[PDB]
Amino acid sequence: VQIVYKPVDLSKVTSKCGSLGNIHHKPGGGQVEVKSEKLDFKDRVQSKIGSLDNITHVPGGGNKKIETHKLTF
Amino acid sequence: VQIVYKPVDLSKVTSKCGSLGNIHHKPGGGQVEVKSEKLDFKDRVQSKIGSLDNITHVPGGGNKKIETHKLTF
Amino acid sequence: VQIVYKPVDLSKVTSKCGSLGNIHHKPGGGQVEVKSEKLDFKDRVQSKIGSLDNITHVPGGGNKKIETHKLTF
Amino acid sequence: VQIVYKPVDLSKVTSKCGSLGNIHHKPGGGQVEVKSEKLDFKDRVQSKIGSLDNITHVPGGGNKKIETHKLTF
Amino acid sequence: VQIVYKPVDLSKVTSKCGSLGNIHHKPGGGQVEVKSEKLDFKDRVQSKIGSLDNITHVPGGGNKKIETHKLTF
Amino acid sequence: VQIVYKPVDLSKVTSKCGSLGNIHHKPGGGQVEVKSEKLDFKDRVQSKIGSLDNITHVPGGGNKKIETHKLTF
Lengths: 73, 73, 73, 73, 73, 73
Prior knowledge:
By secondary structure, chain A is mostly beta strands. Chain A is 0% helix and 63% strand. Chain A is built from no helices and 9 strands. The interface between A and B is large, with 73 and 73 residues. Chains A, B, C, D, E, F: Tau/MAP repeats lie at residues 1-31, 32-63.
């Protein structure tokens, strides 16, 4: 058995942007109110209240090349 | 058995943008109010209240090349 | 048995845009009010209230090339 | 007198090739025989016999840009 | 007199080759036989016999830009 | 008299090659025979016999940029 795994890649992932800007993200501008009375919990409680995990991602490129080469005998 | 795996890739994923901008994201501009009385929970509780996990993604490119080469003998 | 896997790719995925902008996203502008009284839960509770997981995605390109090359003997 | 020589060149000379090969050049494969008897030469003699100056030129690109910018006052 | 010589060059000369190869050059494979009897030369002789000055030229690119800027007052 | 020689060069001469190889040059594989009898020479003789000056040039690039900037007052 003779196996010759010789893939050739000369590819490009490219971006050109003259200017990038004037980006506004205002998550949670409104008031948050949580009133709790006489509540009962028998197991684990996870609670998130307010402004959490919000993202502003503005990469000049942000380009991705994902590649996988699997040879199984 | 003779196997010759020789794929050739000269591809391009390209983007050109003169200007990118004036982007506004206002998730949760309205008030959030949560009133709870005498409630009972016998098992696990996950609670998210307000403005969470909101995303503003403005990549100058944001281009993607995904590639997979599997050889199984 | 002789196998010659030799695909040739010279393809392009291209985008050109003069200007990209003046994008407005206002999810959850209206008031959210949640009243709960004497409720009973025998099993797990997941609760999301307000403005969650909203996305504003404005890539200058956003082009995708997805490729797969499987050889099974 | 005002002279403004401001030409803008953004040109491209591009070549893309998946594979280049299996090129065979066999000049002068046949027998060469030169029999000369009692010849007389009163002036200069230049002589080439056999297989001379043969060329195999296989550039992966071989692209050419020739440019000239002349201003005379 | 005002002379402004402000040319802008943003050019490219580009080659992309996946593979280059299997190139064969066999100049002068045939027998060469020169037989000379009683020849008379009264001036200069230049003689080349056999397999001379043959070229195999296989550049991965081989691309050229030739450029010339001249101002004469 | 005002002369402003301000040319701008941002050019590129580029080559990309996945693989370069399997190049064979066999100049003068055939037998060479030169038989001479009673020849007469009154001036200079230059003689080359066999396999001379053959070239195998295989540069990974081999790209050239030739440029000239002449200003004469």
